[PDB]
Amino acid sequence: PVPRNYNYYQAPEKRSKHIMPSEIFDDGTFTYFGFKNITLQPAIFVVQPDGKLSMTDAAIDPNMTNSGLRWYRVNEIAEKFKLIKDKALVTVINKGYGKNPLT
């Protein structure tokens, strides 16, 4: 068992609701993005300090069934993610970044 940082929020662009996760948390090593079965799967990118984007090391975790969602494990902790599928964009903010997962 590892205390989780659940302190994330999403900021969808227009015509972007169809790619939004329902649950996002990190355990200090990995960031987990849970999507409803009905949601289309975006790519997940991280914002770098330069303002530029990077790919992540992301993949479906078949084992995880939490909340009836489709879960992706990202092998990184970051302050900002961009979820992209064609013109659809959701910015994810880790408000708990640099903080301990006690609170």
Residue numbers in the entry: 1 to 103
According to the publication:
CagX is presumed to be structurally and functionally homologous to VirB9 from the well studied VirB/D4 T4S of the plant pathogen Agrobacterium tumefaciens, although the two proteins have low sequence identity. Here, we report the expression, purification, crystallization, structure determination and analysis of the C-terminal domain of the CagX protein (CagXct).
The CagXct crystal structure was solved by MR and subjected to isotropic B-factor twin refinement in REFMAC5 at 1.4 Å resolution after the true space group had been established as monoclinic P21 with a β angle close to 90°, with the crystal forming a nonmerohedral twin. To maintain structural similarity, many buried protein residues which form the protein core of TraO are conserved or substituted by residues with similar properties in CagX. Most amino-acid residues of strand β1, which runs antiparallel to TraN in TraO, are not conserved in CagX; however, the main chains of the matching residues of both these T4S proteins have the same conformation and solvent accessibility. Interestingly, one of the 2-propanol molecules binds to the main-chain N atom of the Ramachandran plot outlier Asp481 in monomer A in the CagXct structure. The main-chain N atom of the equivalent Gly258 in TraO forms a hydrogen bond to the main-chain O atom of Gly364 in TraF, with the positions of Gly364 and the 2-propanol ligand O atoms overlapping.
